[PDB]
Amino acid sequence: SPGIWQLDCTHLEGKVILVAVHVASGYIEAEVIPAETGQETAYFLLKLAGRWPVKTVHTDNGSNFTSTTVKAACWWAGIKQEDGIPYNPQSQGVIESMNKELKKIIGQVRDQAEHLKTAVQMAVFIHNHKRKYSAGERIVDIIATDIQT
Amino acid sequence: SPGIWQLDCTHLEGKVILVAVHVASGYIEAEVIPAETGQETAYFLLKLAGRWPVKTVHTDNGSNFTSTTVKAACWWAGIKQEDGIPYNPQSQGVIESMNKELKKIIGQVRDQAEHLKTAVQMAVFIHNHKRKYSAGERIVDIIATDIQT
Ligand SMILES: CC(C)C[C@H](CNC(=O)CCCCN)Cc1ccc2c(c1C(=O)O)OCO2
Ligand SMILES: CC(C)C[C@H](CNC(=O)CCCCN)Cc1ccc2c(c1C(=O)O)OCO2
Numbered sequence: 361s362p363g364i365w366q367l368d369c370t371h372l373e374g375k376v377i378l379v380a381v382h383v384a385s386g387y388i389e390a391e392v393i394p395a396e397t398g399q400e401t402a403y404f405l406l407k408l409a410g411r412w413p414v415k416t417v418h419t420d421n422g423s424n425f426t427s428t429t430v431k432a433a434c435w436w437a438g439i440k441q442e443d444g445i446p447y448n449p450q451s452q453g454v455i456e457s458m459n460k461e462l463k464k465i466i467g468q469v470r471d472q473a474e475h476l477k478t479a480v481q482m483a484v485f486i487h488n489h490k491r492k493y494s495a496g497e498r499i500v501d502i503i504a505t506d507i508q509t
Numbered sequence: 510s511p512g513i514w515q516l517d518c519t520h521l522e523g524k525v526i527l528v529a530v531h532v533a534s535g536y537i538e539a540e541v542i543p544a545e546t547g548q549e550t551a552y553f554l555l556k557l558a559g560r561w562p563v564k565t566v567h568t569d570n571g572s573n574f575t576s577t578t579v580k581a582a583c584w585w586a587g588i589k590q591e592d593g594i595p596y597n598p599q600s601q602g603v604i605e606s607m608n609k610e611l612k613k614i615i616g617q618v619r620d621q622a623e624h625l626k627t628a629v630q631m632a633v634f635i636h637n638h639k640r641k642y643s644a645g646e647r648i649v650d651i652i653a654t655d656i657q658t
């Protein structure tokens with residue numbers, strides 16, 4: 361549970377926003393890329409896994425699941441790759457709504473930055489800091505508890 | 510204390526590695542850029558601050574301290590910008606040695622990746638996971654304790 365993340369890819373301004381969500385907390389990391397490739401996804405996972413203890417990733421589609429580069433990165437980082445098929449239905453609708461909510465925040469900050477990538481990082485900030493505890497607080501508490509086990 | 514980070518810039522393969530160290534834990538985040546500019550530093554801080562609760566940053570040099578873009582990003586993200594002058598001497602030598610240690614790990618993984626940026630992320634992974642607790646475990650414990658205050 362503390363180690364489970366879900367990949368999510370959404371589109372804005374002709375570009376792609378790649379998102380990783382920590383399922384138990386709602387905490388996100390995100391980046392802008394020109395298009396979703398196995399190489400970009402693999403690199404994104406390597407960054408994620410050096411920053412948080414990533415045990416399991418629910419991949420966002422079959423092409424990334426199949427990607428030899430994604431597989432290599434998951435092997436390297438000790439990540440168990442899984443399908444993002446809604447084996448659990450509470451995720452797929454929450455993702456749709458997360459994308460909507462993230463895009464809403466992006467629109468709210470968009471005029472404060474020249475580049476989309478900057479607006480996306482501002483939106484990540486706002487998302488992770490917003491008190492319901494915040495997602496940032498929740499992920500830390502979840503993982504801290506897990507270290508004592 | 511839980512919110513204090515230090516910026517560090519080091520060189521390898523004709524490129525620049527920008528590093529943020531969580532002082533109390535030794536946890537790092539890092540990125541490769543062609544050269545250190547205020548714009549790159551500002552963007553790096555925006556990413557950092559959306560991921561961890563950054564209260565204070567000891568900037569790595571005077572040009573970044575002065576940078577209007579760095580100042581803007583620190584204002585936006587609620588970061589108190591400080592000089593990285595060794596007001597405390599336990600940092601400057603530990604940074605020199607951290608750069609040496611990071612470069613050592615980079616050399617150990619370098620042949621496993623085509624691009625330097627990838628090797629740097631692998632090195633971040635190894636650094637943050639290495640059990641002394643690991644830096645990754647320490648930062649989480651430090652921040653979790655601070656949330657209860
Ligand atoms: C996850 C890693 C083990 C491999 C993985 C794939 N690279 C190779 O197979 C090339 C090996 C070069 C041998 N000299 C590394 C990697 C992943 C994602 C990337 C990469 C790289 C890379 O630098 O090779 O560049 C940017 O996006
Ligand atoms: C920290 C932010 C408030 C500002 C900050 C500077 N940008 C501006 O002043 C332009 C304002 C555009 C108004 N339409 C945003 C920023 C920081 C660092 C960057 C940036 C940007 C940006 O996208 O403007 O691009 C990549 O590196």
Ligand SMILES: [Cl-]
Pocket residue numbers: 409410411412413414637638645646
């Ligand atoms: Cl970690």
Ligand SMILES: [Cl-]
Pocket residue numbers: 488489496497558559560561562563
């Ligand atoms: Cl945070």
